[PDB]
Design a binder for these strands. Structure first.
Lengths: 44, 149, 141, 129
RNA sequence: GAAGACGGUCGAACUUGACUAUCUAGAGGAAGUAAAAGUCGUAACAAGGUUUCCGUAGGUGAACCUGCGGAAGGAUCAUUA
RNA sequence: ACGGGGAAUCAGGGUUCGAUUCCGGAGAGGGAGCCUGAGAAACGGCUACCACAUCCAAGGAAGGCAGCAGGCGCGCAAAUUACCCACUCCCGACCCGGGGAGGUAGUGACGAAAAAUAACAAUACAGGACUCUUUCGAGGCCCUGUAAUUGGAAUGAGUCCACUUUAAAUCCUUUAACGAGGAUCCAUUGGAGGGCAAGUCUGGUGCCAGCAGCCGCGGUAAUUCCAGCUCCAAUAGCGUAUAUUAAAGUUGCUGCAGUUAAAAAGCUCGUAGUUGGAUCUCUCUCGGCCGAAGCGUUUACUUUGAAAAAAUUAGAGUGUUCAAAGCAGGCCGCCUGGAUACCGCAGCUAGGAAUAAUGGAAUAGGACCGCGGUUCUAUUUUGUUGGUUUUCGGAACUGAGGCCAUGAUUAAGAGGGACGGCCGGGGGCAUUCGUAUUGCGCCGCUAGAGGUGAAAUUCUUGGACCGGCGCAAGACGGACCAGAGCGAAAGCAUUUGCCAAGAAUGUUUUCAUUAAUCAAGAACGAAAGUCGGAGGUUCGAAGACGAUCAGAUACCGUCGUAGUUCCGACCAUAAACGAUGCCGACCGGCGAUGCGGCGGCGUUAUUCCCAUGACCCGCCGGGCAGCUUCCGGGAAACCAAAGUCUUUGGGUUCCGGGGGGAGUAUGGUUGCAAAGCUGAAACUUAAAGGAAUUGACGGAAGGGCACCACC
């Protein structure tokens, strides 16, 4: 880790690593291009 | 317990309670001071003058007769040495250890015994520089000491 | 003997803070090298994802098979073998399940019979094991 | 070397109440010893003592009663405010009924019960019971 | 009296070097760890069948062995004019 | 790590937390620059750049929730896109407008306070207790219930009109009406082997499943698992995990340890640090005798004062219906309260003067006096007015004289240094002697000799071993040699000389605190080993042989390189040990011993005398030791120190904190190297260990016995 700035940097990469991987599958559904947002509704 | 020895030895002088000059002593204080001036013009230390008056002239304590002690008599008349009595005898002793040491290099006894005589010199030079009996730049250098004594 | 002067507080205050370092309870909580080695990072619980059900053997004078679970932690990727406590409690768990894991109770040391196991499962699939064991709830799929 | 003459002159008279003697010799004496010994004598712990005058530093011969359990010195002489005397006489004394702490105030070497009346702090010298 | 320019200053930032530090794909081998109740002697604890232990140098399948110098934590608190 | 006020715990000392509503700082995605203004380097302002990112008709345009809500992500981990300016206050031109400041609700077992889940009566008991009966047994006299026996009386929780509350509502308070008999309007969470309250009851399982913080439980009778019953603890709460505090005298200032359990540096010197022996009983120029002004050498200490935000903490008053709270209230318009303490260190102030530091004159350019000189110079004096000159005033500097009771505390059973006679296997250099071993020369008589538990490797008429005379080479200094001596420790024994040190003793010498312990830094350091020369007698790591052996790469025997010896460099370690830091005081005996001093009968020698030696009997001082003891310690073994220790504090250095990993890895440094110094963590364990006891075992001894032993 080593010395407060290469720890704050080391957090920023792994924060950027996770925050960009969660976006690579968000556009799988319901964009403006729009495969339509299928909502099934059932009553119990 | 002695400083640079492991011996805890008890041997000294025991001064009596009665502080007065005794009855038989027929020397006044001026006569004792006149004796001291001659015994110092002979070239004796203050530690040797007090012995000669005790053994031969019957004076028990010169501080008890004259009211003053030996060194404050000589330093007031003027016949006193610059470096004091015990610092002389350590410097003169550390010369003869150092002079003998260049003859016999392998003697690791007197090489150790020189440092004890060395380390006693700086304990006294510090004290005399504090009480201002020595000038505050006097230092024992191992090469000049043949001309200090 | 100890120093005992009246101007000796710097000798006293600084002898102690070097002598404090030979205390292993002091050192393990102040050096920082055993909190980057802890799999949690100083949390009471953590969550993970079950890799497999490895069951590990009891230690010397008593024999059984302690059923454990190999967990891979979410927040730092580390791996962990945690112990599934009661009986029939491995039968509420499948693979690739999300498990809240605790410590075992000895603060990062193993608890007697089980070798090298410092954690125990608390909840599986966001329901409690005490709720499943005692039949209060149903395993959600 | 002899740091603290009052320390060696109290463990001389501590070690002889153990061994059952009736007199101690305590050389050398300062005048803090004679003030401390006079406080113990006035509370009946010691009895009469005699100061032998050689020209150097006196010795004291102290006649002992058999009444002293413990005689002690505090080192260093910590400063004691009067609002902090209760902690000292709870750490050092056996009860609230007997035993004294000797402290050197600017009104004289005294007890803790005298120093409370004259409203004085000082430095703790020692204790006896 | 607007645009615009010269020069100064403040200074974000860019480019390339050096020192690093960290996130990242890869055969090879490396050490310790989880056990092991697996095989050959039996180094040690009895004078443990070469009393043992310490330092230091050398040689081995290995516990070790041997040369030098200690210690008793020895198996003697002692050996006769 | 934003800092404080503070918070948790706590005997006393302490330890840890303090993002968080009060004060102070900073910052609005990251740096940077500005405009305006009293105030900003402002972000609910602007301009850039780096990073993200919205619309777009592709030319352009606009961004900044660490405000209130809300969303995603992150995670063990945290509430509503609600109502209102009515309260507390703020802004504006303003009695009027505005305020996600703030207030009110909603969610909320964070947490803290109060507090239901039943009470009572009559029967009956093969229940207990009180009075009598010897006892059976006699009673509303007091209690109890595994009576799901009977019986009314009481009530909330709910359901619910109304009032009250509020901005408007809710909630609580107040009231209608309904509202309890398995009062099903049922109380839970952990446990029942010990720590630790409470079942070796019953069924099941059979070292499995599992329990268990720890010890342990489970292999067919489980006090421990899975359950049923019963019992226990807390109780609208109770388990678990982790942080932390006490327990922990297991961090020790109070208050620990260091011979053998973890641990005193190999020894000594030494700067800083820390600690240091006795001693010493308020006055001048002014104002109305009472105040100014000065002090005296400077402080530490102690006591008082004044200044120290509120809230919190402590604490006073007050029936919130009690309480946690609150700062209110009380009396028949009045009477109240809204106290007070605490608030370390540092800084102000005033009194004390013990303790502790420090000054004050020693070649007197010292105090106090009046005497004279030199230089500068005040501002009043001459009715004002220009000029001169004094006086005094105030300084600064020199020369005599008087006077001071003129001025040095003692000499530590502290230390240094003299001096005196001794003493010692202390050290160095030079010299000297001894027997032995090995080799060599010669002679003698001869076939064996060496070594072993036995042999064997080995030397022999190219004459071994043995007896004799010599020569040399290097090594080593016996017996005398002791629980004796010296040395800082390693360490040191033949004679003689030389050189320079030392302890102890003796002293009516000397200096007069110069001292103790010690970071840094330094000297010496057995053995072994590494660079260079010299020498190699014995012995000899490695190596080669022979034997013992199941096996020997060891023990045993024969050779034998480096080494063992001398000198110049390095290395700096040992069971370098008393496994015991140094200085200091106090504390029992006894007999010896070594060195020095003092006193004394009487024996020897120097011919008798003195003196000295040798003894004999004591005394004193310091040494290495010994025996002894209910001094006291200690877990004991044991220790006159390892004592003077919960009755705990004489000074001071080093150093230990369960066992392993490990004195390892890494980094630095030292070294020719060998290695030396310094020195972890991951993980792993519930014990490792010290003394002592009783057996058992011994190829340890002493004794004893048996034809189930031998002879």
């Amino acid at each position: 880790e080593l010395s407060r700035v290469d720890q704050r940097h080391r957090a920023s990469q792994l924060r950027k690593q996770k925050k960009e991987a969660v976006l690579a599958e968000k556009r799988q559904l319901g964009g403006k291009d729009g495969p339509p947002h299928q909502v099934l509704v059932v009553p119990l | 317990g002695r400083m640079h020895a492991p011996g805890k030895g008890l041997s000294q002088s025991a001064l009596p309670y009665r502080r007065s000059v005794p009855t038989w002593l027929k020397l006044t204080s001026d006569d004792v001071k006149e004796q001291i001036y001659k015994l110092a013009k002979k070239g004796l230390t203050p530690s040797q003058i007090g012995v000669i008056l005790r053994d031969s002239h019957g004076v028990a304590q010169v501080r008890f007769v004259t009211g003053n002690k030996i060194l404050r008599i000589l330093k007031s008349k003027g016949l006193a040495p610059d470096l004091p009595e015990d610092l002389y005898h350590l410097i003169k002793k550390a010369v003869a250890v150092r002079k003998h040491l260049e003859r016999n290099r392998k003697d690791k006894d007197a090489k150790f015994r020189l440092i004890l005589i060395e380390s006693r010199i700086h304990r006294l030079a510090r004290y005399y520089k504090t009480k201002r009996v020595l000038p505050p730049n006097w230092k024992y250098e191992s090469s000049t000491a043949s001309a200090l004594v | 003997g100890k120093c005992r002067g009246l101007r000796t507080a710097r000798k006293l205050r600084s002898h102690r803070r070097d002598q404090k370092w030979h205390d292993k309870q002091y050192k393990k909580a102040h050096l920082g090298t055993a909190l980057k080695a802890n799999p949690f990072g100083g949390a009471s619980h953590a969550k993970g994802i079950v890799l497999e059900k490895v069951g590990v053997e009891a230690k010397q004078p008593n024999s059984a098979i302690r059923k454990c679970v190999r967990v891979q932690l979410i927040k730092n990727g580390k791996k962990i073998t945690a112990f599934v406590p009661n009986d029939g409690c491995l039968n509420f768990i499948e693979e690739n399940d999300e498990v809240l894991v605790a410590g075992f109770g000895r603060k990062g040391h193993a608890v007697g019979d089980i070798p090298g196991v410092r954690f125990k499962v608390v909840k599986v699939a966001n329901v409690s094991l005490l709720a499943l064991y005692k039949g209060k709830k149903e395993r959600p799929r | 070397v002899r740091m603290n003459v009052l320390a060696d002159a109290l463990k001389s008279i501590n070690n002889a109440e153990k061994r059952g003697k009736r007199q101690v010799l305590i050389r050398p004496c300062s005048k803090v010893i004679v003030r401390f010994l006079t406080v113990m004598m006035k509370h009946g712990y010691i009895g009469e003592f005699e100061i032998i005058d050689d020209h150097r530093a006196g010795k004291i011969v102290v006649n002992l009663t058999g009444r002293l359990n413990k005689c002690g010195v505090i080192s260093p002489r910590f400063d004691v405010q009067l609002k902090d005397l209760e902690k000292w006489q709870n750490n050092l004394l056996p009860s609230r009924q007997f035993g004294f702490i000797v402290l050197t105030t600017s009104a004289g070497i005294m007890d803790h019960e005298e120093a409370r009346r004259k409203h004085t702090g000082g430095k703790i010298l020692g204790f006896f019971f």
